[PDB]
Amino acid sequence: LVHVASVEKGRSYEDFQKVYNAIALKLREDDEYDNYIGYGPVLVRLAWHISGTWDKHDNTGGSYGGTYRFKKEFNDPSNAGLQNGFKFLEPIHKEFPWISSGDLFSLGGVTAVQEMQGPKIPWRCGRVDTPEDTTPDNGRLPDADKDAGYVRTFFQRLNMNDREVVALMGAHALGKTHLKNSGYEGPGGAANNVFTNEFYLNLLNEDWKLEKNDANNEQWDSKSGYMMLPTDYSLIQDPKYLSIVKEYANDQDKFFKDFSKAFEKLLENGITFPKDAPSPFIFKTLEEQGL
Ligand code: HEM
């Protein structure tokens, strides 16, 4: 398939900035969510999940068609817990009905990161809603109980290399696991709602113990009360991964630059942007607009 981006008819930057502003203001306002974590984390996860079903082999899946909106994808077990991100976005959509779904879902991840103090992520509009039959089957999202080879192999399907994988994993600093959703439980550090290189620092600095949890799954638990999934821990088991983890742990800026590029790439996978398409936008945060 070819999925050409097509700008929402007659909309420009300022139109997008408004959807952004709306998501942002609601993030501010719904700060009680998940014990005061806020909805940031879950939106980031949502944008990753709708993008992660992509398959470089046949160009199927990916963010383009907003298929997450269909039952099949919505009900994907790997998507448990995402319905909250959805519900949060719904009223926004209602307010700006001309925005396509893939555009909205993805724009929320961007807003989330930036509002949580992360780096600015350039973003492009143009995703087009596609039919229910374009919905990818379940099983395209990664499992958490594996190792580094698994992770490397998986991400290759999305054209991400080693540096991209590690950068993107740095998002694991945010939110937490929820028993009922994934069978894992616990936060991965202390500033779980601010975007920093904490993830890397925790992986290198804590004294991790392997143990089973109440869902009878294994996780790496630290004394401070943090946890790491196997796939997370595997970043220190692989030598190639580990040197990159070290770099980010030592330089937040580098990490921010690499994340930013990787995230965009991840959200733009499988989409063709015509030469005449507008450049990527860089949205101002609420704070830069004095709002
Ligand atoms: C090997 C790859 C990954 C796997 C196996 C993994 C698996 C998981 C699991 C099991 C959860 C917790 C679900 C819950 O019970 O609520 C989680 C949380 C989350 N994931 Fe990943 N994930 C992966 C990669 C990523 C990447 C690439 C991103 C974004 C770049 C992402 C961002 C997050 C976010 C921000 C959270 C927190 C969600 C919340 O607090 O609700 N993860 N991930």
Side-chain angles (χ1 to χ4, degrees), residues 48-70 72-86 88-93 95-130:
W48 127 254
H49 274 215
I50 55 120
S51 300
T53 49
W54 193 55
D55 186 348
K56 80 165 157 184
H57 293 115
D58 57 13
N59 209 14
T60 65
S63 67
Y64 188 95
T67 55
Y68 172 70
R69 75 196 191 273
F70 299 120
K72 197 174 57 169
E73 183 171 340
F74 189 87
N75 295 321
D76 182 2
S78 310
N79 289 336
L82 291 192
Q83 43 282 280
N84 300 322
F86 192 61
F88 174 96
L89 292 169
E90 228 186 44
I92 304 226
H93 207 181
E95 201 178 330
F96 303 85
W98 50 259
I99 196 150
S100 71
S101 299
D103 277 356
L104 184 57
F105 290 155
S106 65
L107 173 62
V110 175
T111 306
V113 167
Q114 297 196 171
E115 291 297 308
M116 276 189 297
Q117 301 189 252
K120 279 309 188 46
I121 315 300
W123 179 90
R124 304 185 85 151
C125 48
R127 297 155 190 89
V128 176
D129 286 29
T130 65

Coordinates of all heavy atoms in Angstrom, one line a residue, residues 48-130, unseen atoms left out:
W48 N 2.3 5.5 20.8 CA 3.3 4.5 20.5 C 2.6 3.3 19.9 O 2.9 2.7 18.9 CB 4.4 4.3 21.6 CG 4.6 2.9 22.0 CD1 4.2 2.3 23.2 CD2 5.3 1.9 21.3 NE1 4.6 1.0 23.3 CE2 5.3 0.7 22.1 CE3 5.9 1.8 20.1 CZ2 5.9 -0.5 21.7 CZ3 6.5 0.6 19.6 CH2 6.5 -0.5 20.4
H49 N 1.5 2.9 20.6 CA 0.8 1.7 20.2 C 0.0 1.7 18.9 O -0.2 0.7 18.3 CB -0.2 1.2 21.3 CG 0.3 0.3 22.3 ND1 -0.4 -0.8 22.9 CD2 1.6 0.3 22.9 CE1 0.4 -1.4 23.7 NE2 1.6 -0.7 23.8
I50 N -0.5 2.9 18.5 CA -1.2 3.0 17.2 C -0.1 3.0 16.1 O -0.4 2.6 15.0 CB -2.2 4.1 17.2 CG1 -1.5 5.4 17.5 CG2 -3.3 4.0 18.2 CD1 -1.5 6.5 16.4
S51 N 1.1 3.4 16.5 CA 2.2 3.4 15.5 C 3.0 2.2 15.3 O 3.6 2.0 14.2 CB 3.2 4.5 15.8 OG 2.6 5.7 15.8
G52 N 3.0 1.4 16.3 CA 3.7 0.2 16.5 C 3.2 -1.0 15.8 O 3.9 -2.1 15.8
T53 N 2.0 -0.9 15.2 CA 1.5 -2.1 14.5 C 2.1 -2.1 13.1 O 1.8 -2.9 12.2 CB 0.1 -1.9 14.3 OG1 -0.1 -0.6 13.8 CG2 -0.5 -2.0 15.7
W54 N 2.9 -1.1 12.7 CA 3.4 -1.0 11.4 C 4.3 -2.2 10.9 O 5.0 -2.8 11.8 CB 4.3 0.2 11.2 CG 4.7 0.5 9.8 CD1 3.8 0.7 8.8 CD2 6.0 0.7 9.2 NE1 4.4 1.0 7.6 CE2 5.8 0.9 7.8 CE3 7.3 0.6 9.7 CZ2 6.9 1.1 7.0 CZ3 8.4 0.8 8.9 CH2 8.2 1.1 7.5
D55 N 4.3 -2.5 9.7 CA 5.1 -3.6 9.1 C 5.7 -3.1 7.8 O 5.1 -3.0 6.8 CB 4.3 -4.9 8.9 CG 5.3 -5.9 8.4 OD1 6.5 -5.8 8.1 OD2 4.8 -7.1 8.6
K56 N 7.0 -2.8 7.9 CA 7.8 -2.4 6.8 C 7.8 -3.4 5.7 O 8.1 -3.0 4.6 CB 9.2 -2.2 7.3 CG 10.0 -3.5 7.4 CD 11.5 -3.2 7.5 CE 12.3 -4.4 8.1 NZ 13.7 -4.2 8.3
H57 N 7.4 -4.6 5.9 CA 7.3 -5.5 4.8 C 6.2 -5.2 3.8 O 6.4 -5.3 2.6 CB 7.2 -6.9 5.2 CG 8.4 -7.3 5.9 ND1 8.4 -7.6 7.3 CD2 9.7 -7.4 5.5 CE1 9.7 -7.9 7.6 NE2 10.5 -7.8 6.5
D58 N 5.0 -4.9 4.2 CA 3.9 -4.7 3.4 C 3.3 -3.3 3.6 O 2.2 -3.0 3.0 CB 2.9 -5.8 3.5 CG 2.4 -6.0 4.9 OD1 2.6 -5.1 5.8 OD2 1.7 -7.1 5.1
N59 N 3.9 -2.5 4.4 CA 3.4 -1.2 4.6 C 2.1 -1.1 5.4 O 1.5 -0.1 5.4 CB 3.3 -0.3 3.4 CG 3.5 1.1 3.8 OD1 3.9 1.4 5.0 ND2 3.2 2.1 2.9
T60 N 1.6 -2.2 5.9 CA 0.4 -2.3 6.7 C 0.6 -1.8 8.1 O 1.7 -1.8 8.6 CB -0.2 -3.7 6.8 OG1 0.7 -4.5 7.5 CG2 -0.4 -4.3 5.4
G61 N -0.5 -1.3 8.7 CA -0.5 -0.8 10.1 C 0.2 0.5 10.2 O 0.4 1.2 9.3
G62 N 0.6 0.9 11.4 CA 1.3 2.3 11.5 C 0.2 3.3 11.9 O -1.0 3.0 12.0
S63 N 0.6 4.5 12.1 CA -0.4 5.6 12.4 C -1.4 6.1 11.5 O -2.4 6.7 11.9 CB 0.3 6.8 13.1 OG 1.1 7.4 12.1
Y64 N -1.1 5.9 10.2 CA -2.0 6.5 9.2 C -3.5 6.5 9.2 O -4.2 7.5 9.1 CB -1.4 6.2 7.8 CG -2.0 6.9 6.6 CD1 -1.5 8.1 6.2 CD2 -3.0 6.3 5.9 CE1 -2.0 8.7 5.0 CE2 -3.6 6.9 4.8 CZ -3.0 8.1 4.3 OH -3.5 8.7 3.2
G65 N -4.0 5.3 9.3 CA -5.5 5.2 9.3 C -6.3 5.3 10.5 O -7.5 5.0 10.3
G66 N -5.7 5.6 11.6 CA -6.4 5.6 12.9 C -7.3 4.4 13.1 O -8.4 4.5 13.7
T67 N -6.8 3.3 12.7 CA -7.6 2.1 12.9 C -7.8 1.7 14.4 O -8.7 0.9 14.6 CB -7.0 0.9 12.1 OG1 -5.6 0.8 12.5 CG2 -7.0 1.2 10.7
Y68 N -7.0 2.3 15.3 CA -7.3 2.0 16.7 C -8.7 2.2 17.1 O -9.3 1.6 18.0 CB -6.4 2.9 17.7 CG -6.7 2.7 19.1 CD1 -6.4 1.6 19.8 CD2 -7.3 3.8 19.9 CE1 -6.7 1.4 21.2 CE2 -7.6 3.7 21.2 CZ -7.3 2.5 21.9 OH -7.6 2.3 23.2
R69 N -9.4 3.1 16.3 CA -10.8 3.3 16.5 C -11.7 2.2 16.3 O -12.9 2.2 16.7 CB -11.3 4.5 15.7 CG -11.6 4.3 14.2 CD -11.7 5.6 13.4 NE -12.2 5.4 12.1 CZ -11.4 5.1 11.1 NH1 -10.0 5.1 11.3 NH2 -11.8 4.9 9.8
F70 N -11.3 1.1 15.6 CA -12.1 0.0 15.3 C -12.0 -1.1 16.5 O -10.9 -1.1 17.1 CB -11.7 -0.6 13.9 CG -12.0 0.3 12.8 CD1 -11.0 0.8 11.9 CD2 -13.3 0.8 12.6 CE1 -11.3 1.7 10.9 CE2 -13.6 1.7 11.6 CZ -12.5 2.2 10.7
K71 N -13.0 -1.9 16.7 CA -13.1 -2.9 17.7 C -12.0 -3.8 17.8 O -11.4 -3.9 18.8 CB -14.4 -3.8 17.7 CG -15.6 -3.2 18.4 CD -16.8 -4.0 18.3
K72 N -11.6 -4.4 16.7 CA -10.5 -5.3 16.6 C -9.2 -4.8 17.3 O -8.7 -5.4 18.2 CB -10.2 -5.7 15.2 CG -9.4 -7.0 15.1 CD -9.1 -7.5 13.7 CE -8.5 -6.6 12.7 NZ -8.1 -7.2 11.4
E73 N -8.8 -3.6 16.8 CA -7.5 -3.0 17.4 C -7.7 -2.4 18.8 O -6.8 -2.4 19.6 CB -7.0 -1.9 16.4 CG -5.7 -1.3 16.8 CD -5.1 -0.4 15.8 OE1 -5.6 -0.7 14.6 OE2 -4.1 0.3 15.9
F74 N -8.9 -1.9 19.0 CA -9.2 -1.4 20.3 C -9.2 -2.4 21.4 O -8.7 -2.1 22.6 CB -10.6 -0.6 20.1 CG -10.9 0.2 21.3 CD1 -10.5 1.5 21.4 CD2 -11.7 -0.3 22.3 CE1 -10.9 2.3 22.5 CE2 -12.1 0.4 23.4 CZ -11.7 1.8 23.5
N75 N -9.7 -3.6 21.1 CA -9.8 -4.7 21.9 C -8.6 -5.6 22.0 O -8.6 -6.6 22.6 CB -11.1 -5.5 21.8 CG -12.3 -4.6 22.3 OD1 -12.2 -3.8 23.3 ND2 -13.4 -4.7 21.6
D76 N -7.5 -5.1 21.3 CA -6.3 -5.9 21.4 C -5.8 -5.9 22.8 O -5.6 -4.9 23.5 CB -5.2 -5.3 20.4 CG -4.0 -6.1 20.5 OD1 -3.9 -7.1 21.1 OD2 -3.0 -5.6 19.7
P77 N -5.5 -7.1 23.3 CA -5.0 -7.4 24.6 C -3.8 -6.5 24.9 O -3.6 -6.0 26.1 CB -4.8 -8.9 24.8 CG -5.6 -9.5 23.7 CD -5.9 -8.4 22.7
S78 N -2.9 -6.3 24.0 CA -1.8 -5.5 24.2 C -2.2 -4.1 24.4 O -1.4 -3.2 24.8 CB -0.8 -5.7 23.0 OG -0.5 -7.0 22.7
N79 N -3.4 -3.7 24.1 CA -3.9 -2.4 24.2 C -4.7 -2.1 25.5 O -5.1 -1.0 25.7 CB -4.6 -1.9 22.9 CG -3.7 -1.7 21.8 OD1 -2.5 -1.4 21.9 ND2 -4.3 -1.7 20.6
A80 N -4.8 -3.1 26.4 CA -5.5 -2.9 27.6 C -5.1 -1.7 28.4 O -3.9 -1.4 28.6 CB -5.3 -4.1 28.5
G81 N -6.0 -0.9 28.9 CA -5.6 0.3 29.6 C -5.6 1.5 28.7 O -5.7 2.7 29.2
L82 N -5.5 1.4 27.4 CA -5.4 2.5 26.5 C -6.8 3.2 26.3 O -6.9 4.4 25.8 CB -4.9 2.2 25.1 CG -3.3 1.8 25.1 CD1 -2.8 1.8 23.6 CD2 -2.6 2.9 25.8
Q83 N -7.8 2.5 26.6 CA -9.1 3.0 26.5 C -9.3 4.3 27.3 O -10.1 5.2 27.0 CB -10.3 2.0 26.6 CG -10.0 1.1 27.8 CD -9.0 0.0 27.5 OE1 -9.4 -1.0 26.8 NE2 -7.8 0.2 27.9
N84 N -8.4 4.5 28.3 CA -8.5 5.7 29.1 C -7.9 6.9 28.3 O -8.4 8.0 28.5 CB -7.7 5.8 30.4 CG -8.2 4.7 31.4 OD1 -9.4 4.5 31.5 ND2 -7.2 4.1 32.0
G85 N -6.9 6.6 27.4 CA -6.4 7.7 26.7 C -7.4 8.2 25.7 O -7.6 9.3 25.4
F86 N -8.1 7.2 25.1 CA -9.1 7.4 24.2 C -10.2 8.3 24.7 O -10.4 9.3 24.2 CB -9.8 6.0 24.0 CG -10.7 6.1 22.8 CD1 -10.1 6.4 21.5 CD2 -12.1 5.9 22.9 CE1 -11.0 6.4 20.4 CE2 -12.9 6.0 21.8 CZ -12.3 6.2 20.5
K87 N -10.8 7.8 25.8 CA -11.9 8.6 26.4 C -11.4 10.0 26.7 O -12.1 11.0 26.6 CB -12.3 7.9 27.7 CG -13.2 6.7 27.5
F88 N -10.2 10.2 27.1 CA -9.7 11.5 27.4 C -9.7 12.4 26.1 O -10.0 13.6 26.1 CB -8.3 11.4 27.8 CG -7.5 12.8 28.0 CD1 -7.4 13.4 29.3 CD2 -6.9 13.4 27.0 CE1 -6.7 14.5 29.5 CE2 -6.2 14.6 27.1 CZ -6.1 15.2 28.4
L89 N -9.4 11.8 24.9 CA -9.3 12.5 23.7 C -10.7 12.8 23.0 O -10.8 13.8 22.2 CB -8.4 11.8 22.7 CG -6.9 11.9 23.1 CD1 -6.1 10.9 22.2 CD2 -6.4 13.3 23.0
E90 N -11.6 11.9 23.2 CA -12.9 12.0 22.6 C -13.6 13.4 22.5 O -14.0 13.8 21.5 CB -13.8 11.0 23.3 CG -14.7 10.0 22.6 CD -15.6 9.3 23.5 OE1 -16.1 10.1 24.5 OE2 -15.7 8.1 23.6
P91 N -13.7 14.0 23.7 CA -14.3 15.3 23.7 C -13.5 16.3 22.9 O -14.0 17.3 22.4 CB -14.2 15.8 25.1 CG -13.3 14.9 25.8 CD -13.3 13.6 25.0
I92 N -12.2 16.0 22.7 CA -11.5 17.0 22.0 C -11.8 16.9 20.5 O -11.8 17.8 19.8 CB -10.0 16.6 22.2 CG1 -9.8 16.6 23.7 CG2 -9.2 17.6 21.3 CD1 -8.6 17.3 24.2
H93 N -12.0 15.6 20.2 CA -12.3 15.3 18.8 C -13.6 15.9 18.4 O -13.8 16.5 17.3 CB -12.4 13.8 18.5 CG -12.0 13.5 17.1 ND1 -12.0 12.3 16.5 CD2 -11.7 14.4 16.1 CE1 -11.7 12.4 15.3 NE2 -11.4 13.7 15.0
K94 N -14.5 15.8 19.4 CA -15.8 16.4 19.3 C -15.7 17.9 19.1 O -16.5 18.5 18.4 CB -16.7 16.2 20.5 CG -17.6 14.9 20.4
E95 N -14.7 18.4 19.7 CA -14.6 19.9 19.5 C -13.9 20.2 18.2 O -14.1 21.3 17.7 CB -13.7 20.3 20.6 CG -13.8 21.8 20.9 CD -12.9 22.3 22.0 OE1 -12.7 21.3 22.9 OE2 -12.5 23.4 22.1
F96 N -13.1 19.3 17.7 CA -12.4 19.6 16.4 C -12.6 18.4 15.5 O -11.7 17.6 15.3 CB -10.9 19.9 16.7 CG -10.5 20.9 17.7 CD1 -10.5 20.7 19.0 CD2 -10.2 22.2 17.2 CE1 -10.1 21.7 20.0 CE2 -9.8 23.2 18.1 CZ -9.8 23.0 19.5
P97 N -13.8 18.3 15.0 CA -14.1 17.2 14.2 C -13.5 17.1 12.8 O -13.6 16.0 12.2 CB -15.6 17.2 14.2 CG -16.1 18.6 14.5 CD -14.8 19.3 15.1
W98 N -12.8 18.1 12.4 CA -12.2 18.0 11.1 C -10.8 17.3 11.1 O -10.3 17.0 10.0 CB -11.9 19.4 10.7 CG -11.2 20.3 11.7 CD1 -11.8 21.2 12.5 CD2 -9.8 20.4 12.0 NE1 -10.9 21.8 13.3 CE2 -9.6 21.4 13.0 CE3 -8.6 19.8 11.5 CZ2 -8.4 21.7 13.5 CZ3 -7.4 20.1 12.0 CH2 -7.3 21.1 13.0
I99 N -10.3 17.0 12.3 CA -9.0 16.4 12.5 C -9.1 14.9 12.3 O -10.0 14.3 12.8 CB -8.3 16.7 13.8 CG1 -6.8 16.3 13.7 CG2 -9.0 15.9 15.0 CD1 -5.8 17.1 14.6
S100 N -8.2 14.3 11.6 CA -8.4 12.9 11.4 C -8.0 12.1 12.7 O -7.2 12.7 13.5 CB -7.5 12.4 10.3 OG -6.1 12.4 10.6
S101 N -8.4 10.9 12.8 CA -8.0 10.1 14.0 C -6.5 9.9 14.1 O -6.0 10.1 15.2 CB -8.6 8.8 14.0 OG -10.0 8.9 13.9
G102 N -5.8 9.4 13.1 CA -4.4 9.2 13.3 C -3.7 10.5 13.6 O -2.8 10.5 14.4
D103 N -4.2 11.6 13.1 CA -3.6 12.8 13.4 C -3.8 13.1 15.0 O -2.8 13.5 15.7 CB -4.0 14.0 12.5 CG -3.2 14.0 11.2 OD1 -2.3 13.3 11.0 OD2 -3.4 15.1 10.6
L104 N -5.0 13.0 15.5 CA -5.3 13.3 16.9 C -4.5 12.4 17.9 O -3.9 12.9 18.8 CB -6.8 13.0 17.0 CG -7.4 13.3 18.4 CD1 -7.1 14.7 18.8 CD2 -8.8 12.9 18.5
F105 N -4.5 11.1 17.7 CA -3.9 10.1 18.5 C -2.4 10.4 18.6 O -1.8 10.2 19.6 CB -3.9 8.7 17.9 CG -5.3 8.2 17.9 CD1 -5.8 7.3 17.0 CD2 -6.2 8.7 18.9 CE1 -7.1 6.8 17.1 CE2 -7.5 8.3 19.0 CZ -7.9 7.3 18.1
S106 N -1.9 10.8 17.5 CA -0.4 11.1 17.5 C -0.1 12.4 18.0 O 0.9 12.6 18.7 CB 0.2 10.8 16.1 OG -0.3 11.7 15.1
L107 N -1.0 13.4 17.8 CA -0.7 14.7 18.3 C -0.8 14.7 19.8 O -0.1 15.4 20.5 CB -1.7 15.7 17.6 CG -1.5 17.0 18.3 CD1 -0.1 17.5 18.0 CD2 -2.5 18.0 17.6
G108 N -1.6 13.8 20.4 CA -1.6 13.8 21.9 C -0.3 13.3 22.5 O 0.1 13.7 23.6
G109 N 0.4 12.3 21.8 CA 1.7 11.8 22.3 C 2.7 13.0 22.4 O 3.4 13.3 23.3
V110 N 2.7 13.8 21.2 CA 3.5 15.0 21.1 C 3.2 16.0 22.2 O 4.1 16.5 22.8 CB 3.4 15.6 19.7 CG1 4.2 16.9 19.5 CG2 3.9 14.5 18.7
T111 N 1.9 16.3 22.4 CA 1.5 17.2 23.4 C 2.0 16.8 24.8 O 2.5 17.6 25.5 CB 0.0 17.5 23.3 OG1 -0.3 17.8 22.0 CG2 -0.4 18.6 24.3
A112 N 1.7 15.5 25.1 CA 2.0 14.9 26.3 C 3.5 15.1 26.6 O 3.9 15.7 27.6 CB 1.6 13.4 26.4
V113 N 4.4 14.6 25.7 CA 5.8 14.8 25.9 C 6.3 16.2 26.2 O 7.1 16.5 27.0 CB 6.6 14.3 24.7 CG1 8.0 14.7 24.8 CG2 6.4 12.8 24.6
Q114 N 5.8 17.1 25.4 CA 6.2 18.5 25.5 C 5.6 19.2 26.7 O 6.3 20.0 27.3 CB 5.8 19.3 24.3 CG 6.4 18.9 22.9 CD 6.4 19.9 21.8 OE1 7.0 19.7 20.8 NE2 5.7 21.1 22.0
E115 N 4.4 18.8 27.1 CA 3.9 19.4 28.3 C 4.5 18.8 29.5 O 4.4 19.4 30.6 CB 2.3 19.4 28.3 CG 1.7 20.3 27.3 CD 1.9 21.8 27.4 OE1 1.7 22.3 28.7 OE2 2.4 22.5 26.5
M116 N 5.1 17.6 29.4 CA 5.8 17.0 30.6 C 7.2 17.4 30.6 O 8.1 16.7 31.2 CB 5.7 15.5 30.5 CG 4.4 15.1 31.0 SD 4.2 13.3 31.2 CE 4.4 12.7 29.4
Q117 N 7.5 18.5 30.0 CA 8.8 19.1 29.9 C 9.8 18.4 29.0 O 11.0 18.6 29.0 CB 9.3 19.4 31.3 CG 8.5 20.4 32.1 CD 9.2 20.8 33.4 OE1 8.8 20.4 34.5 NE2 10.3 21.5 33.2
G118 N 9.3 17.4 28.1 CA 10.3 16.8 27.2 C 10.8 17.7 26.1 O 10.6 18.9 26.1
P119 N 11.5 17.1 25.1 CA 11.9 18.0 24.0 C 10.8 18.3 23.1 O 9.7 17.7 23.1 CB 12.9 17.1 23.3 CG 12.5 15.7 23.5 CD 11.7 15.7 24.8
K120 N 11.0 19.3 22.2 CA 10.0 19.5 21.2 C 10.1 18.5 20.1 O 11.3 18.2 19.7 CB 10.4 20.8 20.5 CG 10.1 22.0 21.2 CD 8.6 22.0 21.7 CE 8.2 23.4 22.3 NZ 8.6 24.6 21.5
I121 N 9.0 17.9 19.7 CA 9.0 16.9 18.7 C 8.3 17.5 17.4 O 7.1 17.9 17.5 CB 8.1 15.7 19.2 CG1 8.4 15.2 20.6 CG2 8.1 14.5 18.2 CD1 9.8 14.7 20.8
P122 N 8.9 17.6 16.3 CA 8.3 18.2 15.2 C 7.2 17.2 14.7 O 7.4 16.0 14.9 CB 9.4 18.4 14.1 CG 10.7 18.3 14.9 CD 10.4 17.3 16.0
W123 N 6.1 17.7 14.2 CA 5.0 16.8 13.8 C 4.3 17.3 12.5 O 4.3 18.4 12.2 CB 3.9 16.9 14.9 CG 2.7 16.2 14.7 CD1 2.4 14.9 15.1 CD2 1.5 16.7 14.2 NE1 1.1 14.6 14.8 CE2 0.5 15.6 14.2 CE3 1.1 17.9 13.6 CZ2 -0.8 15.8 13.7 CZ3 -0.1 18.1 13.2 CH2 -1.1 17.0 13.2
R124 N 3.9 16.3 11.8 CA 3.2 16.5 10.5 C 1.8 16.0 10.5 O 1.5 15.0 11.0 CB 4.0 15.8 9.4 CG 5.4 16.1 9.4 CD 6.2 15.5 8.2 NE 6.1 16.3 7.0 CZ 7.0 16.5 6.0 NH1 8.1 15.8 6.0 NH2 6.6 17.3 5.0
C125 N 0.9 16.8 9.8 CA -0.5 16.4 9.7 C -0.7 15.7 8.4 O 0.2 15.7 7.6 CB -1.4 17.7 9.6 SG -0.8 18.8 8.3
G126 N -1.9 15.1 8.2 CA -2.0 14.4 6.9 C -2.5 13.0 6.9 O -2.8 12.4 5.9
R127 N -2.5 12.4 8.1 CA -3.0 11.1 8.3 C -4.5 11.0 7.8 O -5.1 12.0 8.0 CB -2.8 10.4 9.7 CG -1.3 10.3 10.0 CD -1.0 10.3 11.5 NE 0.5 10.4 11.8 CZ 1.1 11.6 12.0 NH1 0.6 12.8 11.9 NH2 2.5 11.5 12.2
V128 N -4.9 9.9 7.2 CA -6.2 9.8 6.7 C -6.9 8.5 7.2 O -6.4 7.4 7.1 CB -6.3 9.8 5.2 CG1 -7.7 9.6 4.7 CG2 -5.6 11.1 4.7
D129 N -8.1 8.8 7.7 CA -8.8 7.7 8.2 C -9.1 6.6 7.2 O -9.4 6.9 6.0 CB -10.1 8.2 9.0 CG -9.7 8.9 10.3 OD1 -8.7 9.4 10.6 OD2 -10.7 8.7 11.1
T130 N -8.9 5.4 7.5 CA -9.1 4.3 6.6 C -10.1 3.4 7.2 O -10.4 3.4 8.4 CB -7.8 3.6 6.1 OG1 -7.2 3.0 7.2 CG2 -6.9 4.6 5.5

